[PDB]
């Protein structure tokens, strides 16, 4: 990859890493895997990353929140419970951990596990409590793909969230398990059973 | 493989007709696909559909359910709504159906209906979301069934020589009790 | 499992009494020739994309 001698010398394997063509230390975003059409430029994450740690100014318009990156979003979403909120090294680090469990839960490409699952846990149509005369009903709606992939989100860490309390397991492993039971849906994982139950009931009240 | 409806045209509502006509025959032609001659002479308009124009069978009957509804004194907007619509019909009743007024009696019980500057009219309508024409001795209304029954409950409290008040209170009932719904 | 496609081309407004949910019409992606009227629980803009399951219902007016 011809290497640099400095004085102070940048370390070989950070070289090495990078001039192959690769954007983490273990994992790259060339290899990347979007289902439908309405994800693809939602969950859009084409800029490399060593540390899933940007100052995202995305708050400031509605669309743009689609443009920041979904492992940094997904990072960001891991800081829920509010004894770990202001502490996105916790939440950075726990993600590289689960990256380091998918490796080794012999699945060749964490990245694309990660999309599936987001892929598949956001719900298709919905419901809402529309008035229709005291008695509430439920008129069965079509949440927008923005939502779908925030629910997505949400219902992954907050499943993960809610498996790794009380129970000796870390965060990063139950994470890695709710990623890869909703990567490819087993109806073992949270998010799974929510988005099936949530577009059951839309089924139902139409 | 044709159908042929034919309809005549009051003498009255035909200079508006011949005034809009312009508005009026393309979205039949054009957005339903239909033949609409029309007779200046026998004062008739003439709905035909023939195997060139496409296979919908209600659609020459909404088209001769538009063209009576712009006869009965409808605006346009309203007919339309017609074409496009199915759950909205068309009412009629005399005034001697309900109770027979004589002479002055009748006139002061059409204006109990209209009001001061249409206002009680008006006020029907938009609790009702319907359409009202007070002709002579006929009244028509335009809209959904369960619409246009509680409009013909309200109208006739009316013409029963009920206050316009009390029909005040009963359509702010029925429009909440309905708009609830 | 039947995954419709969608195409929010036109967006209506606001509607339902807590004022939400945002009625849209839809420009079907597999079949060109459908267009849909959709109901979004969701903030939605021109040219979206979203995935029915009943391309067959349509819906008036919200409560």
Redesign the interface.
């Given at each position: 990859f011809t290497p640099v001698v400095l004085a102070t010398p940048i370390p070989e394997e950070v070289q090495q890493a990078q001039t192959e063509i690769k954007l983490f230390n273990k994992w790259s975003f060339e290899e990347v895997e979007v289902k439908d059409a309405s994800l693809v430029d939602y969950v859009q994450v084409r800029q490399p990353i060593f540390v899933a740690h940007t100052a995202g100014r995305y708050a400031n318009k509605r669309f743009r929140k689609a443009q920041c990156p979904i492992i940094e979003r997904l990072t960001n979403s891991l800081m829920m419970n509010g004894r770990n909120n202001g502490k996105k090294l916790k939440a950075v680090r726990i993600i590289k951990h689960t990256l380091d469990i998918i490796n080794v839960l012999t699945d060749q490409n964490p990245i694309q596990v990660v999309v599936d699952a987001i892929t598949n846990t956001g719900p298709r149509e919905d419901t809402t409590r529309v008035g229709g005369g005291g008695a509430a009903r439920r008129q069965a709606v079509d949440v927008s793909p923005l939502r779908r992939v925030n629910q997505a989100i949400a219902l992954l860490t907050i499943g993960a969230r809610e498996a790794a309390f009380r129970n000796i397991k870390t965060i990063a492993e139950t994470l890695a398990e709710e990623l890869i039971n909703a990567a490819k849906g087993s109806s073992t994982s949270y998010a799974i059973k929510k988005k099936d139950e949530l577009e059951r009931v839309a089924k139902s009240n139409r | 493989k044709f159908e042929s409806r034919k309809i005549m045209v009051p003498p009255h509502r035909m200079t508006p007709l011949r005034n809009s006509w312009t508005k009026i025959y393309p979205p039949l032609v054009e957005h339903l696909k239909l033949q609409v001659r029309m007779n200046l002479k026998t004062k008739s308009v003439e709905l035909r559909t023939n195997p060139k124009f496409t296979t919908d069978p209600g659609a020459l009957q909404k088209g001769a359910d538009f063209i009576k509804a712009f006869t009965l004194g409808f605006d346009l907007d309203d007919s339309i709504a017609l074409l496009r619509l199915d759950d909205l019909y068309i009412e009629t009743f005399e005034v001697k159906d309900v109770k027979t007024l004589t002479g002055d009696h009748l006139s002061r019980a059409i204006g109990r209906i209209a009001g001061k500057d249409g206002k009680t009219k008006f006020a029907i309508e938009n609790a009702t979301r319907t359409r009202i024409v007070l002709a002579d001795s006929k009244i028509h209304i335009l809209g959904g069934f369960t619409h246009i029954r509680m409009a013909r409950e309200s109208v006739v409290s009316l013409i029963l020589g009920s206050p316009p008040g009390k029909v005040y209170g009963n359509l702010r009932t029925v429009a909440s009790?309905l708009?609830?719904? | 499992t039947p995954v419709t496609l969608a195409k929010v081309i036109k967006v209506l407004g606001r509607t339902g009494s807590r004022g939400g949910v945002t009625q849209v019409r839809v420009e079907f992606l597999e079949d060109t020739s459908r267009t849909i009227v959709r109901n979004v629980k969701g903030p939605v803009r021109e040219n979206d994309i979203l995935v029915l399951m009943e391309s067959e219902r349509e819906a008036r007016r919200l409560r």
């Open positions: - | 009790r708009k609830e719904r | -």
